[PDB]
Enzyme design. Structure first.
Site, PDB file in Angstrom:
ATOM      1  N   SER A  90      10.526 -21.893  -6.964  1.00 26.77           N
ATOM      2  CA  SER A  90       9.652 -22.541  -5.986  1.00 26.77           C
ATOM      3  C   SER A  90       9.771 -21.748  -4.686  1.00 26.77           C
ATOM      4  CB  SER A  90      10.026 -24.021  -5.937  1.00 26.77           C
ATOM      5  OG  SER A  90       9.285 -24.699  -4.945  1.00 26.77           O
ATOM      6  N   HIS A 226       8.642 -29.106 -13.257  1.00 25.42           N
ATOM      7  CA  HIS A 226       9.054 -28.344 -12.084  1.00 25.42           C
ATOM      8  C   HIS A 226      10.567 -28.197 -11.972  1.00 25.42           C
ATOM      9  CE1 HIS A 226       9.757 -28.004  -7.573  1.00 25.42           C
ATOM     10  NE2 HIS A 226       9.118 -26.890  -7.892  1.00 25.42           N
TER      11      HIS A 226
END
Length: 249
Positions: A90, A226
């Site tokens: 990320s 994620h």
């Protein structure tokens, strides 16, 4: 130091993997990694100034400022005999990339760069938080997955966390280039990772990193959302080790 050890090297391995964390991720986010060493390299986590043992510092608001701090630290602290692997997920992917850029310029290219779960630098994420007020900001954070609704009910947690979270998300959302030709591509061997059900970074958004990387494999898809570097740590580290056999002797 920004870097804190999570795994010592073992079985004689000389590699050192340095991981840049999620936006707003913390020390505690990676305790699961400390519970069981999944590869023989040394493994350290990067702490952004402003939290954990660096709470006496104001949070930086720029990916490239974080990268300059980290590149300087690694240049000073990593022996040139140590195979260095830089990884990031990320927002950490952006810092890892820019840190790799600085080390590469200096003649100190790492042995590998792992870009995980992040859109490429000429793109914007489809999720955008910095323009939102506090209630909306938190609702996005909750939707992403690493934030309790309890945060909404405590103004003190909000006054503590929101400046940190807002600093992180401003950094990662303001990080953007108009075109890949603004910089030469990086030559450090690179691995792209993305998640099969990662709502923050699609396969296409991660594939777009190939505009910036001369020697790149991937995207390699890890089955998860994620949080796959944590919830699917075994696949995450398997793919890292597999793609960098030189560095793991």
């Amino acid at each position: 130091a920004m870097c804190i050890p999570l795994w010592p090297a073992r079985n004689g391995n000389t590699a050192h993997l340095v991981m840049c964390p999620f936006a707003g991720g913390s020390s505690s986010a990676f305790r699961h990694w400390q519970a069981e060493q999944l590869a023989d390299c040394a493994l350290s986590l990067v702490t952004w100034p402003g939290r954990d043992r660096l709470r006496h510092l104001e949070p930086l608001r720029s990916i490239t400022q974080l990268a300059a701090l980290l590149a300087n630290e690694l240049e000073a602290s990593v022996s040139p005999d140590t195979p260095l692997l830089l990884a990031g997920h990320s927002m950490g992917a952006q810092v890892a990339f820019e840190t790799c850029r600085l080390l590469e310029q200096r003649g100190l290219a790492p042995q590998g760069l792992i870009i995980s779960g992040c859109h490429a630098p000429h793109l914007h994420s489809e999720r955008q938080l910095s323009h939102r007020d506090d209630a909306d900001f938190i609702a996005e954070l909750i939707d992403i997955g690493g934030c309790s609704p309890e945060l909404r009910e405590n103004q003190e947690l909000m006054s503590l966390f929101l400046p940190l979270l807002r600093a992180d998300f401003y950094a990662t959302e303001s990080y953007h280039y108009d075109s890949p030709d603004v910089c030469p591509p990086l030559r450090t061997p690179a691995l792209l990772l993305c998640g099969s059900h990662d709502r923050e970074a699609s396969w296409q958004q991660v594939d777009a990193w190939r505009q910036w990387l001369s020697h790149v494999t991937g995207p390699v898809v890890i089955d998860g959302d994620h949080f796959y570097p944590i919830q699917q740590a075994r696949s995450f580290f398997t793919q890292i080790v597999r793609h960098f056999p030189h560095a793991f002797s």
